[PDB]
Scaffold this active site. Structure first.
Site, mmCIF file in Angstrom:
data_model
loop_
_atom_site.group_PDB
_atom_site.id
_atom_site.type_symbol
_atom_site.label_atom_id
_atom_site.label_comp_id
_atom_site.label_asym_id
_atom_site.label_seq_id
_atom_site.Cartn_x
_atom_site.Cartn_y
_atom_site.Cartn_z
ATOM 1 N N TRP A 8 0.886 -1.156 0.000
ATOM 2 C CA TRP A 8 0.000 0.000 0.000
ATOM 3 C C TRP A 8 0.940 1.226 0.000
ATOM 4 O O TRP A 8 1.771 1.378 0.893
ATOM 5 C CB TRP A 8 -0.831 -0.055 1.283
ATOM 6 C CG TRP A 8 -1.784 1.057 1.458
ATOM 7 C CD1 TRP A 8 -2.703 1.490 0.558
ATOM 8 C CD2 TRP A 8 -1.951 1.853 2.632
ATOM 9 N NE1 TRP A 8 -3.442 2.508 1.086
ATOM 10 C CE2 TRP A 8 -2.997 2.754 2.362
ATOM 11 C CE3 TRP A 8 -1.313 1.901 3.864
ATOM 12 C CZ2 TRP A 8 -3.441 3.683 3.307
ATOM 13 C CZ3 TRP A 8 -1.754 2.833 4.805
ATOM 14 C CH2 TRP A 8 -2.799 3.709 4.513
ATOM 15 N N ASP B 65 -0.423 -5.193 9.547
ATOM 16 C CA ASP B 65 -1.356 -4.190 9.113
ATOM 17 C C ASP B 65 -2.560 -5.097 8.830
ATOM 18 O O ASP B 65 -2.494 -6.001 7.989
ATOM 19 C CB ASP B 65 -0.852 -3.509 7.849
ATOM 20 C CG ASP B 65 -1.808 -2.470 7.340
ATOM 21 O OD1 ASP B 65 -1.482 -1.771 6.369
ATOM 22 O OD2 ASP B 65 -2.903 -2.350 7.904
ATOM 23 N N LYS C 86 -13.116 -0.728 6.390
ATOM 24 C CA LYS C 86 -13.694 -1.559 5.350
ATOM 25 C C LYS C 86 -14.680 -2.650 5.774
ATOM 26 O O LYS C 86 -15.744 -2.797 5.159
ATOM 27 C CB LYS C 86 -12.581 -2.133 4.469
ATOM 28 C CG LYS C 86 -11.781 -1.058 3.734
ATOM 29 C CD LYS C 86 -10.342 -0.943 4.238
ATOM 30 C CE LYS C 86 -9.522 0.083 3.430
ATOM 31 N NZ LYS C 86 -8.128 -0.090 3.878
HETATM 32 C C1 LIG Z 1 -7.202 0.907 3.896
HETATM 33 C C2 LIG Z 1 -5.860 0.476 4.450
HETATM 34 C C3 LIG Z 1 -5.293 1.091 5.530
HETATM 35 C C4 LIG Z 1 -5.900 2.271 6.167
HETATM 36 O O1 LIG Z 1 -6.985 2.034 7.096
HETATM 37 P P1 LIG Z 1 -7.989 3.417 7.301
HETATM 38 O O2 LIG Z 1 -8.800 2.732 8.243
HETATM 39 O O3 LIG Z 1 -8.584 3.669 5.934
HETATM 40 O O4 LIG Z 1 -7.054 4.433 7.713
HETATM 41 C C5 LIG Z 1 -4.109 0.650 6.000
HETATM 42 N N1 LIG Z 1 -3.503 -0.436 5.407
HETATM 43 C C6 LIG Z 1 -4.056 -1.035 4.354
HETATM 44 C C7 LIG Z 1 -3.338 -2.181 3.739
HETATM 45 C C8 LIG Z 1 -5.239 -0.597 3.880
HETATM 46 O O5 LIG Z 1 -5.809 -1.186 2.820
#
Ligand SMILES: *Cc1c(COP(=O)(O)O)cnc(C)c1O
Ligand SMILES: *Cc1c(COP(=O)(O)O)cnc(C)c1O
EC number: 2.6.1.1
Lengths: 396, 396
Positions: free
Chosen positions: A130, A211, A246
């Site tokens: 990312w 993450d 998400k």
């Molecule tokens: C979307 C995403 C984030 C960020 O999370 P938010 O809740 O949108 O800040 C971090 N890491 C990855 C891999 C993501 O897809």
């Protein structure tokens, strides 16, 4: 003061949206989207969420400050979600959770925490990863190195190269792993490859940092955490940055958590005091609304059942589109075999398109994808599948 | 990794709360509080706010990401609140606003922005000031210097010493000013002293940074911005970090704004692109709920009328307690004259108590105040006024 300031470059992800809104062509198709869309191209608020917000409206009696680490209930629910209830980590009181402004906010607080109270100097990120990982870590003055991961030929996880690269990673370095639904490839390690990485990890002295932004999008809630659980069983220390943006469709409410795991409660408590000090100096205390919604849903059996169902529905839809995509491509005359798409997890997939092909798809067909080739499957619907596949093929 | 981590010291403000909750004595009185309490010691959610949340519940159709700088409507309402509608700054398109996670979040983004795209190296903060200013700026690697401000004898603004100190401030340095209701003293400059500071400021080349967390708590909404307006008329560049935590009672929703002002739109736009890049690498995009409430209230005449009324009510209550405090002290036998209390603005007041007296008030009488002597007048009620004044006097 500001006369000399150079304009910052376009965010590789967010900048695409701007080009899209300006492309007055009608047939537009935005696949470089980072969020979920449903059958009608909408991204509604979950019913469980609306139900939780109603409950909050008639039960909140104050908007008083939350306390640096946020809502306690929220903290334990995330810990159970991440480690499971029969978790020694939870029973040994080895983990501490801080509610943060989203998953990005969790990564930053982890980053400031490590850079300031630790001798960490490098973070190993996958190639690719990312785009915002680099900026977050660099913001804290940490250097970002990258390990191999993707196999541009077989469209798979090059595990040998992965491990080969990580060998240059020294003890004390932070190695970042995506819990599941790897962004942007959709390629995740297997339980066996994870267990191998967990062992290699403790043997080399790496500090793992997971993450976790898509729990529940690959196979299911618990299944998706097996990789993290494999690591949590063999490591004394660990850091996980999770997001509920998400899987709860709570994107703009900024809901996430930074979980700290240490050898014992005495240690994690001492270390956590410095993590709270980093938040205090950043945003002070976290936004209550989103986290409040997540805690009430997760704590109520009725509401949690509706949520999980809404989540499986989202998951099933993505899997349906991955299948329909591969099929439509084939009947549209695709020469190359895109079956690997069906092998990938979550919303994203590296279409295996060149910088020139995506550029051509954009300017000639109105199809938008990230320059890397990343495509969001949840941006496809049975209504736009055909036009999309025809463009993709015409560019092959 | 974490075995060597030293426990972080107690936050001078927040750490007091912990001692309080643990003091099982009944007669407790917490005056080191940073928020507003009403006649019954409660800190309710405003009616205008509840009305706005209802409207949002039945009108929101998505929780999709907000965009780095947040809700546009919110941005312009804050600009009008800060600069007024007949503002050249707004008509010249010289200001840009980013919605942030509270006022602290605004200070941090300003701090990272300046430290990274500017040659700023020092920030001048008043002595005393809000304890978290130092930590926020130091977090960005900026050094914090302090100018004189308070007169420990006459309990006033020592303007000569103030100006005397600021002379060591060089061109390019950032000088921080509290818009109104100075935390912790309650001592604000007069329109004449502000105009003098504004001129001295442009002549010396300082970069002003207004921390504005109590607009509407001193005299009124527009009156409280006169100091900022005096500066905005003579400066090409300026930065204001505002909060809606206190004046909207939206503390835990994290609502604030960082407003950037440059010579022209072309410049502020270029500079703002780097401010958005700093947010992207910190928390990504801001929490929608609180800011959404503020934008709907401020944009609806009916709701804004109820809010303003609720705000004047809060303001009037604080002024009532300042008066009752001074009076009760006198009839309780106070030897010293506390009339200066009535001269101070907002929630806080430096009681003019020694470190030893506050310590004694705490352990012997159960009265809690910040070690600096800071006392929150909104923590007093007609019910606890007497006990409080008796303790204060017994310690004189
Ligand atoms: C979307 C995403 C984030 C960020 O999370 P938010 O809740 O949108 O800040 C971090 N890491 C990855 C891999 C993501 O897809
Ligand atoms: C309360 C306060 C802040 C912080 O605003 P939040 O909205 O609580 O983050 C900043 N500066 C001063 C002077 C304050 O009193």
């Amino acid at each position: 003061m500001f006369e000399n300031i150079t304009a910052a470059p376009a965010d590789p992800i967010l900048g695409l949206a701007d080009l899209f809104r300006a492309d007055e062509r009608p047939g537009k198709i935005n696949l470089g989207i980072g969020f979920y869309k449903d059958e009608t191209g909408k991204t509604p608020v979950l019913t469980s969420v609306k139900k939780a917000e109603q409950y909050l409206l008639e039960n909140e009696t104050t908007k008083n400050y939350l306390g640096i680490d946020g809502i306690p209930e929220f903290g334990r629910c995330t810990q159970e979600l991440l480690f499971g209830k029969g978790s020694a980590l939870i029973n040994d009181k080895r983990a501490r959770t801080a509610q943060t402004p989203g998953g990005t906010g969790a990564l930053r607080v982890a980053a400031d925490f490590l850079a300031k109270n630790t001798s960490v100097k490098r973070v190993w990120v996958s190639n690719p990863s990312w785009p915002n990982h680099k900026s977050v870590f660099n913001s804290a003055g940490l250097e970002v190195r990258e390990y191999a991961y993707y196999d541009a030929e077989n469209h798979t996880l090059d595990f040998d190269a992965l491990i080969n690269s990580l060998n240059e990673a020294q003890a004390g370095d932070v190695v970042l792993f995506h819990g599941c639904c790897h962004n942007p490839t959709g390629i995740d390690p297997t339980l066996e490859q994870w267990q191998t990485l967990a062992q290699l990890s403790v043997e080399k002295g790496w500090l793992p940092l997971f993450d976790f932004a898509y729990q529940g999008f690959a196979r299911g809630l618990e299944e998706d955490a097996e990789g993290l659980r494999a690591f949590a069983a063999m490591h004394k220390e660990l850091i996980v940055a999770s997001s509920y943006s998400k899987n709860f469709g709570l994107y703009n409410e900024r809901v996430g958590a930074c979980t700290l795991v240490a050898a014992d409660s005495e240690t994690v408590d001492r270390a956590f005091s410095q993590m709270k000090a980093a938040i205090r100096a950043n945003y002070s205390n976290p936004p209550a609304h989103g986290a409040s919604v997540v805690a009430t849903i997760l704590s109520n059996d009725a509401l949690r059942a509706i949520w999980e169902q809404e989540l499986t529905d989202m998951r099933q839809r993505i899997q349906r589109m991955r299948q329909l995509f591969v099929n439509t491509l084939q009947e549209k005359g695709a020469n190359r075999d895109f079956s690997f798409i069906i092998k990938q997890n979550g919303m994203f997939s590296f279409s295996g398109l060149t910088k020139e092909q995506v550029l051509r798809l954009r300017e000639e067909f109105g199809v938008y994808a990230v320059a890397s080739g990343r495509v969001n499957v949840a941006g496809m619907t049975p209504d736009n599948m055909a036009p999309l596949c025809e463009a993709i093929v015409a560019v092959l």
